[PDB]
């Protein structure tokens, strides 16, 4: 069980779609992080290891 495409007039399956769209978003902001200076590599590395 997954998402699928039906055509509008035929109302029959002609194509398939990922199940990754038609749900909620994978990343609410941008996929790459905003901070590229970092304050996680600079700031508490020890804890981060």
Partner 1 sequence: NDKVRFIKDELRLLQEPGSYVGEVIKIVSDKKVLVKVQPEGKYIVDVAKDI
Partner 2 sequence: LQSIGQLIGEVMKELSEEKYIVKASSGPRYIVGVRNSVDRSKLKKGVR
Residues that bind partner 1 (CB under 8 A): 7, 10-12, 14
Shortest Å, Cβ 35 to partner 2: 23
Q: Is 9 in the site for partner 2 (CB under 8 A)?
A: no
Among residues 40, 42, 3, 43, the alpha carbon closest in space to that of 21 is found at 3
Angle, vertex CA 16, rays to CA 13 and CA 21, nearest 5: 125
Does residue 25 bind partner 2 (CB under 8 A)? Answer: yes
Query: Is residue 6 within 8 Å of residue 12, measured between CB atoms?
Result: yes
Is 5 one of the binding residues for partner 2 (CB under 8 A)?
yes
Nearer to partner 1, 7 or 44 (CB): 7
């Amino acid at each position: 069980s997954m998402s699928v495409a039906l055509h509008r007039h035929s109302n029959a399956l002609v194509d398939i779609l990922p199940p990754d769209s038609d749900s909620s978003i994978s990343v609410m902001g941008e996929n790459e992080k905003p901070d590229v200076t970092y304050a996680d590599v600079g700031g508490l590395d020890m804890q981060k290891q």
